[PDB]
Design a protein around this ligand. Structure first.
Ligand code: MTA
Length: 263
């Protein structure tokens, strides 16, 4: 209930703080969808932003071993209340500072992520190579980026970052009313399933360069970033791509081949 969430906040003298991107899940049906997207719980679960503990409780009740990382210390009493009697390790810390590279191989991320950290956090977790599955809520626009196909407005660096590490699924869209307080945009449930690759800095130097200068062809964008123009011309030719092809027209394999051609 939006009422129960409002009432719970009121009882604990809390107000949702925009500095923490606080928008708390209201629907048991959405909670169920998140748990069902993440299961089976074959490794330890990390939840970033447990908030009032709604998803934390759902995860624990499904038998997950949970570490929940919450930056807002004001939420400690409600979390302790919600999670009374349940084995959750509550960590009061900025999740952007948590030692992610050390989590057990096979871990899971399951989280209603704060909008302002979702992209750098997911990027970092994917670079660790440690997760079996990452299941999380993001703004619909960010989900679209993470799941974009080439030659579309949402297609870009983030799409390619996700794709390099993982297959990506947008499973469900949630309206603003799924949260209290309601945010201004729709959200989406995303599932990422890592496929083995760790960071490839050479590849991402190329990908970042490709998309840096948006109004240029791929060739001129790379040339402006310091890639030898003649070599880019040849690599594109060898790929059977048009001289004026744009960055958003290349899929992950094409970028991998382009990188290989440049070197
Ligand atoms: C969508 S609700 C977001 C949840 O994440 C928490 N949160 C916001 N920023 C961070 C952060 N940097 N690390 C951990 N939790 C956070 C918020 O306080 C809230 O419970």
């Amino acid at each position: 209930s939006p009422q129960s969430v409002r009432a719970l906040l009121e009882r604990h003298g809390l107000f949702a703080d925009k500095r923490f991107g606080q928008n708390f899940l209201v629907s048991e049906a959405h909670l169920r969808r998140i748990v069902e997207a993440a299961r089976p719980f074959t490794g330890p679960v990390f939840e970033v932003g447990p908030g009032l503990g709604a998803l934390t409780r759902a995860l624990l009740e499904a038998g997950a071993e949970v570490t929940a990382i919450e930056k807002d210390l004001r939420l400690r009493p409600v979390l302790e209340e919600t999670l009374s009697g349940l084995p959750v390790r509550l960590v009061f810390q900025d999740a952007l500072l948590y030692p992610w590279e050390e989590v057990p191989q096979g871990s899971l991320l399951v989280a209603n992520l704060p909008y302002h950290i979702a992209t750098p956090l997911v990027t970092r977790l994917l670079k660790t190579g440690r997760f079996a599955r990452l299941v999380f809520l993001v703004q619909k626009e960010v989900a679209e980026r993470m799941t974009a196909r080439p030659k579309t407005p949402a297609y870009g660096v983030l799409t390619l970052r996700v794709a390099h590490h993982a297959v990506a699924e947008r499973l469900f869209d949630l309206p603003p009313g799924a949260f209290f307080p309601p945010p201004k945009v729709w959200s989406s449930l995303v599932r990422l399933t890592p496929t083995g690759a760790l960071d490839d800095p050479g590849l991402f130097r190329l990908v970042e360069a490709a998309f840096g200068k948006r109004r240029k062809t791929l060739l001129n964008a790379l040339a402006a970033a310091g890639y030898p123009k003649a070599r880019v011309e040849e690599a594109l030719r060898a790929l059977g791509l048009p001289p004026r092809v744009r960055a958003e027209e290349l899929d992950l394999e094409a970028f991998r081949r382009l990188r290989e051609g440049l070197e």
